[PDB]
Amino acid sequence: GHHHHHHKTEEGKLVIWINGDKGYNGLAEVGKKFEKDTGIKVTVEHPDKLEEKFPQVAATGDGPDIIFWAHDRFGGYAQSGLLAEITPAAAFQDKLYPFTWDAVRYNGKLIAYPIAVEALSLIYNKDLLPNPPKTWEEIPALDKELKAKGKSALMFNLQEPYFTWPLIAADGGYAFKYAAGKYDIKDVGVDNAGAKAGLTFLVDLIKNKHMNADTDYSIAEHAFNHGETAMTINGPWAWSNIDTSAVNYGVTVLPTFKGQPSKPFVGVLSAGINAASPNKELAKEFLENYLLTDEGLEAVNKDKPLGAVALKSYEEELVKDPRVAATMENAQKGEIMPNIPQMSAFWYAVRTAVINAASGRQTVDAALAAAQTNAAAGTCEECSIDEDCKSNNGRWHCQCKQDFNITDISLLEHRLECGANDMKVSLGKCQLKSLGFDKVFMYLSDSRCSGFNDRDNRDWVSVVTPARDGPCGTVLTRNETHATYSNTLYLADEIIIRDLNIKINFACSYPLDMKVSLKTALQPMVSALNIRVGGTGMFTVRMALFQTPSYTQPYQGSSVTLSTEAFLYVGTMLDGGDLSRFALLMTNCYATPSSQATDPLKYFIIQDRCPHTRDSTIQVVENGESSQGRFSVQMFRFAGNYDLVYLHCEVYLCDTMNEKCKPTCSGTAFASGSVIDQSRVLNLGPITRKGVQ
Amino acid sequence: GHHHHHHKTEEGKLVIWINGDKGYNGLAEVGKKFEKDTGIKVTVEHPDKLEEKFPQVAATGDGPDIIFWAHDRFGGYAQSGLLAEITPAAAFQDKLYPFTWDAVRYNGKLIAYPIAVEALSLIYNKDLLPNPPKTWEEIPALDKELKAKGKSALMFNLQEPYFTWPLIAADGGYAFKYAAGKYDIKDVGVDNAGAKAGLTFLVDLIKNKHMNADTDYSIAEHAFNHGETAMTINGPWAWSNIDTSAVNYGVTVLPTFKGQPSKPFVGVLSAGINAASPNKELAKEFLENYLLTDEGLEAVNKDKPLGAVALKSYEEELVKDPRVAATMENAQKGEIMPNIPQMSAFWYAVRTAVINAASGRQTVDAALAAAQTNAAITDISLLEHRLECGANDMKVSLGKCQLKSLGFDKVFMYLSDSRCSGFNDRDNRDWVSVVTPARDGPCGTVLTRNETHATYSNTLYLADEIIIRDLNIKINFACSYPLDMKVSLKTALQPMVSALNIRVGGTGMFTVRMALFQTPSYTQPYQGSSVTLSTEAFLYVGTMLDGGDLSRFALLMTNCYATPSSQATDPLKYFIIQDRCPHTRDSTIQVVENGESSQGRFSVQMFRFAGNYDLVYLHCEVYLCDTMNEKCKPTCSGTAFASGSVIDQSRVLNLGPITRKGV
Ligand SMILES: OC[C@H]1O[C@H](O[C@H]2[C@H](O)[C@@H](O)[C@@H](O)O[C@@H]2CO)[C@H](O)[C@@H](O)[C@@H]1O
Ligand SMILES: OC[C@H]1O[C@H](O[C@H]2[C@H](O)[C@@H](O)[C@@H](O)O[C@@H]2CO)[C@H](O)[C@@H](O)[C@@H]1O
Ligand SMILES: *[C@@H]1O[C@H](CO)[C@@H](O)[C@H](O)[C@H]1NC(C)=O
Ligand SMILES: *[C@@H]1O[C@H](CO)[C@@H](O)[C@H](O)[C@H]1NC(C)=O
Ligand SMILES: *[C@@H]1O[C@H](CO)[C@@H](O)[C@H](O)[C@H]1NC(C)=O
Ligand SMILES: [Zn+2]
Ligand SMILES: [Zn+2]
């Protein structure tokens, strides 16, 4: 007997959200194992701002069955009843460390499964520095030293407060005072001396050009991984990218500040179950039986490291690695995050205060003051990066930052969205509003198509144009495969009455569908072949001839006529079933002097999936790659004896799962493939010479 | 015998240059037979760097009458007009394979005679191992195993790029892109990922002491023939030395790299005629009558193997040997060398990249970059950005010249994942492009859904230096697609849906689903076990078949109706679709899709329809309609239908309750 019996005839499913920076593939593999055993499928998807999006959808009774995050968010969900209560047997609970269970406990109830323990650690290049700086104060020396070598000392994400927090709290800065076994929200440690010291040091570092304020995760990763930075600050999940990198690296404790250790907020990677989920039992089985296991966490950790796991058995072995040991050493120096809801607001309040102090929009005192005032305020979560959250006597509100520093380049930063029938270009609203823009922010080649405040995203100001030639001065450009719709975005120096000239040429390229070209034609010349697949499958292959190199504007009527130098553009299309499963392959294409496809005289354009020769007389654009295929032939230059010829194409449906369809053509011919299945042949003709202007 | 008439009182001589690794003796023997018949002397010499030496002497109106080499060089000579045009009869051309003639063709003219087809093959001791390693990745293991015996696994010449090329080209590597029937010289495939993979693997091989970077032809041949190496990689011309050796050997296909086959550059051994020679006629007779023949090639091939010959007659018999067959198999995997002149410059650029990466003088990136380069201010500030949204992929492209105009000395761009890096993109314009799948989570791509649409977005970082300066730019790009009904239904956590299992042919299992949707796009399905509607609200219903390929069938909804009770058999029915057609001609009912596809879709204003009752249940009878007769999609002329309707309850899907807003 098998496990599969209990879940048989399941209409149930399992949907998982996790941040893409952790290993999704290992989790997916565990999903494949779960699918193997139980016969139930498991999906893993990464939405933008998933921790923020989850509550929104979850409120409506929709979302993933499982959500992965650091515990600090979870209690915020629990307060809203978005998380189903976990109630595992003691035997199971005993397998994980109690503090990891404490992290996920909220208001007495377990709202999630602890997975792993996350703490920021100091990552450095072993080749570049043998001994890393043990303190923060000695880094500027290193940077000044390394600046001569054409490199930098330290680069790490400055955009997320998670990364800058440890230095701030190093001297005793804190989020929410823990008192009488409970967190006090009206007691906030943001504006004290230690925070100011840490942040002042950070600002003083970036002011000295030791680090750029524009630096983010991606940039720092890229910089460090190319060995152009001596060290960075990060968690286990990064390591996977460094291993593959030629960089020889090491992980140790963060540097001290004022003789005090860096105090990182320690996260617990945790898996919550949606309260709306019908699948809760399956989720519990999956998480308990499969996800948390030596093998499972081995897999996930193998894709990307988890750091210190909550599972005792695997951890006891996993600690043997020095890096996670360093991660623990760091964690023990810092403090585990509160799971309370306010943490959502806190993080937002710091981020605003760090970037303002870094950009120089405010002093550390002013920034931290605003921060402390906004620490528990939930409204401030609604504010974008470029917005200040301002506190009135009555209530908090969002406001655009009053001052931006804009290079002639900064204006070129933009969002380009290519939709199916339309194109949209978007630019930051505040950066524009800063310059005195009330309205009519921007326009395209046609000045009548103007900017509007984006109805979806308050942050953006957007311009839209259909993707077709002639509205809003949009322009179409075709090549054999694709149709590219392009336009230019002008910025208006008028309303602001100040001149800095920039324009952005943007374009959306879409694949060309010849079936549309055929449907557009009143009476196109086309041959069709129905192909039955198995009991229930049915497919259709069509072959048609086109007047243009774009493979558009097909010939109409019962005959085609060519100039001596003319190119015939042939194309083939597949319909029915999954166009993904099968790829359209043209196995043998040839011409005959007669109408019979069985003609003893065959002139092969394509033979054995490959061109008959390398001459320009035959050009094959698309074969075996997709649902369509395309090739051109100069017909009467290729076969010249005859005043007309007929065209024949043998076609085969290529399963892309079990065989690779795209042919490899060496330019050496066997001529052993002369066997043709006439049931698979499409025929078109006659193809005649003009003989008249 | 009677040939003697056309040659009497003979004069002049014939001088031939050919590489010494091929049979010099056989060619000379044929030359001596030619001398016997014609009474004209023929000299055969093998100079050092003969291919480089030929143009030098040829420029002065001095040199050999005939030159033997791979075709890739010849177009370089032809461009210099050092080669006389050959004009053999069709009857003769039919005797050799056309592609061999295509190789020797340049700018429309045939500049030389094809002799043989050469491709690198994997030579191994058949006695030593029954089956050779099928991949490159497993070689270090074999070597480590063989390291205990005081020997090595694989040794071959690393000095000539010709021998190392296949691994480089195994994964997506290429010299010159073949487009519109001609080779593109400004389109170069040297700096791509696969080449880097292969060459990096090679460096990693020599770094592990599995093979010495100093290894050359002599060393590998001498070593393998003496049994100090288990296997090597080489062409036919080497075999002659292995045959005499007591070693029992075999020849097979090169090992795969990254799941893809090795693509050796396939050479065509070819004989060109000097343009300065008055003796061209004699050269032509020599090449046509004697050199290319069963008897002629027999001598040369018997002396040393030519591999697969261009001559049909001799090849047809010669294929029966497994070695040349393996050589053919290898040839079929790779691609023939372009005949263009630039190849002369190419080989020089790669050779530098092979030795520099091996010795450790440069990184693979630097070497391949330099090679690729060798192969081929600001007033207003503007940028060129092109986004291509494919079905399975996205490509983002930025124009080079604009980046230069914007003051970028060098271009580094990448996505959220720094592992995804830009490459040089050749189109109607020269671009720098990055590619990513259109699904979320590779390359740090992220999904954003709204009720109607699934939007896949990512950020493109663009900067001059890896260490970031004051100038760095980032560009957010996104591809938004409409949501599929099935997908919308499958994505939903707890959608309201009714399902019916169907068997077809008694084989396999399929199902039919009916579900309710909040949007006119038929997306954003209702959640829960019940739906509640305003009096004026529109219920968007859809029905789809799932669980495998039903493509031969179109989903047809014959009768769809509402009942005040939960019973589908209720005598009181309000018909939305009756006799396959919409009950009313009004905006109150719209049937979007019926009998057309695997899906069906319709909207109804439910409570103007149901009237007096504050709740209803929805019922849809469904059938698989065979589309072969093309009668499936129903035609509705008028709103008048028979009240009597025959319904099979086994095919009816039921959903409810559907309740009115405000009690
Ligand atoms: O910086 C604010 C952010 O910090 C934490 O998120 C971390 C997370 O702990 C790590 O697992 C890793 O993924 O990096 C994240 C930040 O980039 C908090 O969990 C989160 O609520 C908070 O917004
Ligand atoms: O390595 C560069 C070199 O490769 C080719 O020459 C080959 C030749 O094609 C083979 O037949 C073999 O036997 O000898 C050479 C080994 O490299 C190119 O034809 C030549 O121009 C180039 O220098
Ligand atoms: C110029 O912009 C940068 C980055 O924002 C920063 O130095 C600051 O915002 C501006 N300069 C000053 C002196 O404030
Ligand atoms: C056609 O142009 C598009 C961009 O406009 C490009 O992505 C595609 O590769 C081009 N087709 C070919 C065959 O090069
Ligand atoms: C959903 O988002 C897409 C992505 O741009 C947009 O095109 C569409 O208009 C949006 N639909 C609604 C109903 O907001
Ligand atoms: Zn089970
Ligand atoms: Zn003669």
Short mmCIF file of C-alpha atoms in Angstrom, two decimals, chain B residues 36 50 52 129 134 165 201 262 274 278 313 467 488 557 578 588 596:
data_model
loop_
_atom_site.label_atom_id
_atom_site.label_comp_id
_atom_site.label_asym_id
_atom_site.label_seq_id
_atom_site.Cartn_x
_atom_site.Cartn_y
_atom_site.Cartn_z
CA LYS B 36 54.47 8.72 -66.13
CA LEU B 50 52.53 26.97 -45.46
CA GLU B 52 50.79 31.86 -43.98
CA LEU B 129 37.48 0.86 -21.73
CA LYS B 134 29.88 10.62 -22.72
CA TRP B 165 37.05 24.98 -30.29
CA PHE B 201 36.08 24.29 -17.84
CA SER B 262 30.60 19.35 -29.01
CA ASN B 274 47.77 29.59 -58.20
CA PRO B 278 50.72 29.17 -66.80
CA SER B 313 32.20 6.99 -55.28
CA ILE B 467 32.27 50.10 -8.02
CA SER B 488 -7.76 32.82 -12.56
CA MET B 557 -23.52 24.58 -23.20
CA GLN B 578 -32.18 27.43 -24.09
CA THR B 588 -29.47 41.45 -19.69
CA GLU B 596 -16.28 27.65 -29.91
#
